[PDB]
Amino acid sequence: RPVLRSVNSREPSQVIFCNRSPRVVLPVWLNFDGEPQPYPTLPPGTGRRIHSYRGHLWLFRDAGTHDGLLVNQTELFVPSLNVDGQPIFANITLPVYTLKERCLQVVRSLVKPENYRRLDIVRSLYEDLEDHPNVQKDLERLTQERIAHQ
């Protein structure tokens, strides 16, 4: 959607992606049409200089599972103009997952999807296991929260 999208400012902004999580991080750039584009991943505890632009939008996920992550305590990161040539830091961290979500992550990392139904757990959880994290669904959710909050 045009709501969540990068603006073609053409105004360079120096940024540093800092992975302060124990996950391999996938930076995702929202292009000019609001479509998510992947960028090189970051290993845990590593940082990297990025040449981005004022008004561009970024979000971050676990590279292998797409589990949600936060950047500077929030969902989206928007580069601003550099002051005194100081790069803008994008500190990526794990959010406090609910205990239920964390257990689902672990079970998913150990079980093949075609085997979920073989687990001796309550019926309702089968659906939860199958409803894995999805960036597209997140963008739609964020857009509703975005609009529907004014």
Binding site: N8, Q37, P40, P43, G45, T46, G47, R48, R49
Partner: peptide
């Protein structure tokens, strides 16, 4: 329309 890009540079460990 200019997109983001990564300069050839060595990553650094977060201390």
């Amino acid at each position: 329309m200019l997109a983001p890009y990564i300069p050839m540079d060595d990553d650094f460990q977060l201390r």
